[PDB]
């Protein structure tokens with residue numbers, strides 16, 4: 614028997630401002646459905662406190678997508694609209710099974726592609742330094758596919774316990790805080806200026822796995838998104 618995330622109070626604020634995409638972007642459950650007890654192996658309350666996401670398959674996802682609160686439609690904001698857009702979370706990333714290589718756990722996306730992904734990564738060298746089993750940010754600064762179109766940053770090695778995140782966007786600049794420590798400050802987003810279709814996402818988005826059956830698994834102890842100003 615799986616317990617629904619909405620059976621406790623902790624995640625109601627974000628569920629009231631989200632729809633769930635599972636197992637792909639085009640297949641979704643509404644905010645009302647989430648608040649109404651949506652549950653399954655892909656999305657359930659683990660150990661009485663974690664909103665847990667599970668997904669297998671290349672580029673499949675089980676992921677919340679920001680909505681206007683209280684039965685509203687899809688949100689679309691701009692990095693330069695003068696408001697501060699903030700997402701917060703507390704995440705336990707457990708050991709990922711063999712075949713899972715990268716799992717995107719928070720994003721800023723838009724109708725013109727992902728501005729930001731925060732992802733767990735099994736192994737990668739960044740700026741000449743090898744990192745393993747860690748959390749990375751990937752920020753798009755161009756629309757090409759080569760790595761020159763991104764800024765990639767090691768944020769933190771994966772921890773045994775819950776890890777907090779805060780993403781702040783204000784006046785075309787991005788700050789990321791992990792476990793209370795600033796890990797990116799003032800990253801320029803002015804390439805996305807004018808793109809009025811941005812929104813937060815969070816959950817599990819499985820990137821470039823080496824097995825199609827390997828199930829990514831991510832646990833949220835907290836998640837919220839807000840505007841201030």
Ligand code: NA
Pocket residue numbers: 707
């Ligand atoms: Na676990």
